[PDB]
């Protein structure tokens, strides 16, 4: 139960990824949410929030309930800009309407995950207990320059 869920290989389609917002690029197009795919190359190769505040989020709808065991976040360098999410929290939901924050057994507080320190390195965090649900949201808490992401999810089908 540790196989990538499809962010970088395309199994997870563009329609399954949404966000609170997303910036317009110098090229006119957008740093769309579905571009936040691991190791993506190109002019606009990541998700970039339109506004840098602690009220943003990237949502991945897996379509069915799955078992998620890990996540990898990556940053993004565009022109002279070096951006990456330094830390974040995770929220999940079975229906997509009510959200539950991820926290460790006996946490009265939200679990803050350690993110990136550069724009290319991969930082992998494991979930224990694992998250079993359909929708997952990455909530950036701190970042460098701008909130930019590229990620991958790991887990497996349930039964």
UniProtKB/Swiss-Prot annotation:
Domain spans labelled F5/8 type C: 1-156
Source species of the chain: Homo sapiens (Human)
Positions annotated as glycosylated: 144
Gene designation per UniProt: F5
Full-sequence portion shown in this chain: 2066 to 2224 of 2224
Protein name listed in UniProt: Coagulation factor V light chain
Cystine residue pairs: 1-156
């Amino acid at each position: 139960c540790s196989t990538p869920l499809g962010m970088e290989n395309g199994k997870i389609e563009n329609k399954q990824i949404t966000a609170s917002s997303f910036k317009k690029s110098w090229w006119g197009d957008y740093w769309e949410p579905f571009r936040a795919r691991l190791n993506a190359q190109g002019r606009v190769n990541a998700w970039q929030a339109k506004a840098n505040n602690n009220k943003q989020w990237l949502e991945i709808d897996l379509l069915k309930i799955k078992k998620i065991t890990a996540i990898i976040t990556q940053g993004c360098k565009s022109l002279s800009s070096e951006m990456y999410v330094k830390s974040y929290t995770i929220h999940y939901s079975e229906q997509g309407v009510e959200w539950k924050p991820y926290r460790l057994k006996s946490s009265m507080v939200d679990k803050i995950f350690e993110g990136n320190t550069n724009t290319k390195g991969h930082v992998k965090n494991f979930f224990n207990p694992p998250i079993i649900s359909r929708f997952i949201r990455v909530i950036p808490k701190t970042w460098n320059q701008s909130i930019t992401l590229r990620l991958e999810l790991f887990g497996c089908d349930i039964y």
